[PDB]
């Protein structure tokens, strides 16, 4: 599955690259830990090859996944009722889910909010971090530059 140079997503730390796989033994078992280090967090994280999908690591989103996430960011109005604190807990859970589709739904909801009403400090920090991780994902899914992805966001948010 995985090899050196695999541009890979890692919940929750977003995108990151692998340097190698070290032949380390734990409990008499020479496990093949893959040594992966992220760019955002600035840290390395090595993990067994086996439990990759179990912890939740994933190949970068393919172009059809990109199309679906754009379609989810261009999604309809479907919204939550009153108790914004209820929605705060909800969309924070969504963020914690680490799925690109759900995170896009988070950022789209907060976009329709801060466009119209105006968030609070916690709301804006929420939207900021969500947009950060989503920009990282899009930049490394299109295989493009940073500001390009945010521009694609603001232009897809517009429609």
């Amino acid at each position: 599955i995985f090899k050196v140079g695999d541009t890979v997503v890692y919940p929750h730390h977003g995108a990151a690259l692998v340097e190698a796989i070290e032949t380390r033994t734990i409990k008499g078992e020479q496990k093949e830990y893959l040594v992966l280090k992220v760019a955002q967090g600035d840290l390395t994280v090595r993990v067994p090859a086996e439990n990759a999908e179990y912890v939740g690591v994933r190949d970068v989103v393919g172009q059809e996944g990109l199309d679906k996430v754009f379609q989810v960011l261009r999604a309809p109005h479907t919204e939550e009722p009153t108790n914004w604190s209820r929605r705060y807990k909800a969309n924070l859970e969504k963020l914690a889910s680490g799925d690109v589709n759900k995170v896009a739904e988070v950022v789209r909801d907060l976009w329709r909010r801060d466009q119209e009403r105006g968030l609070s400090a916690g709301e804006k920090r929420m939207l900021a971090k969500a947009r950060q991780i989503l920009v990282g994902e899009l930049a490394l899914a299109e295989s493009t530059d940073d500001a390009k992805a945010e521009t694609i966001l603001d232009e897809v948010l517009a429609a």
Binding site: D42, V45, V55
Partner: protein
């Protein structure tokens, strides 16, 4: 788990510290390490201390 305390060079030379009231100091970096037993990982960084 912690390990490997290393000092970078001082941030201000002595005389300028004494002048501007800067306390003559130097940063600590400590290579931390987080390990989950149930699944098995490492979260190794270079923390500013």
């Amino acid at each position: 788990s912690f390990s490997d305390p290393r000092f970078d060079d001082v941030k201000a030379p002595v005389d300028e510290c004494k002048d501007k009231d800067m306390t003559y100091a130097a940063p600590l970096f400590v290579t931390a390490e987080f390990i989950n037993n149930n699944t098995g990982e490492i979260k190794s960084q270079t923390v500013f201390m």
